[PDB]
Design a protein around this ligand. Sequence first.
Ligand SMILES: N[C@@H](CCCC(=O)N[C@@H](CS)C(=O)NCC(=O)O)C(=O)O
Ligand SMILES: [Fe+2]
Length: 329
Amino acid sequence: SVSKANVPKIDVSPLFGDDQAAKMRVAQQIDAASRDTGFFYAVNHGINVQRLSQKTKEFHMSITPEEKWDLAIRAYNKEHQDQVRAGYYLSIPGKKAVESFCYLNPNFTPDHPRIQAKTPTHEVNVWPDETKHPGFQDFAEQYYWDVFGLSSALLKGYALALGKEENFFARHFKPDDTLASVVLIRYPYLDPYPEAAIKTAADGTKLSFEWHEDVSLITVLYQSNVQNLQVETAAGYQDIEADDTGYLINCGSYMAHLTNNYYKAPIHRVKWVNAERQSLPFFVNLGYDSVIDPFDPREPNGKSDREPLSYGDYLQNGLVSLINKNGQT
Ligand SMILES: N[C@@H](CCCC(=O)N[C@@H](CS)C(=O)NCC(=O)O)C(=O)O
Ligand SMILES: [Fe+2]
């Protein structure tokens, strides 16, 4: 009885080029999707997602329990007090099925000014031993830059869609300072699948991750071809079809803040599925001190009754709140 959500496939390739008319026609499609269910698939995006999937699989299936402790975030290993965001997020057999590896901007090096200053939300990535995972760090860092590139193009489309100049968001999304993250999530097949690792929604649906708005400007997501996501709409939660050739795009709550809820952050959740699969989000985050002045594209003077919020304030508050609401991942 759970209807397919309207999730259009938008050819985003004009956003990489210089045909302004064509870009406006893509922006209209982004506007439409953003006003409807809040999701679309970006197609013709130029990223080799099959290779991303293969390299990620090789990592997930070769990492050992020893390596996971050695890379673990603070929530799992008290010795790693600097690792709030970046590192390994362990499963707990019998209790918690999902496990993952998160990394941040590769430019956050020991000498980076924000690392020196110890500013919250900035960390130096941790990586497994190169000889045990040959090529993995290099692949993963290049992937960061490939999806950064796609996200910059998408941000040009969102800006045009909102009646702005195309750099309105992108000017704040910079290699030297972006707080964006990649998460390489493994969802396992388990037989038996422990009930303790399954949540139940109010409507009785079995879930792996509860309802939420994303903490992002936008989210740029690759998933395996196994249906799992649902979006809350007015006729109920609806199934978002999988498409392992496309990137699933949606707004996060910073976009809702900037646009005075004209582009809402859609509410969505992750169904429980007993399948070995991947979920690989890129969270498009700005710089720590990036402030965009809020506006309202439904009002004649564009004025909004929201206050400016720096991205760093937003992000630290949001990530902590999401862990309190929906649990440590
Ligand atoms: N550690 C990350 C933030 C992770 C936020 C989070 O928990 N996201 C969920 C909800 S959007 C997710 O990615 N879910 C994916 C899925 O498949 O469940 C970072 O420091 O930036
Ligand atoms: Fe999400």
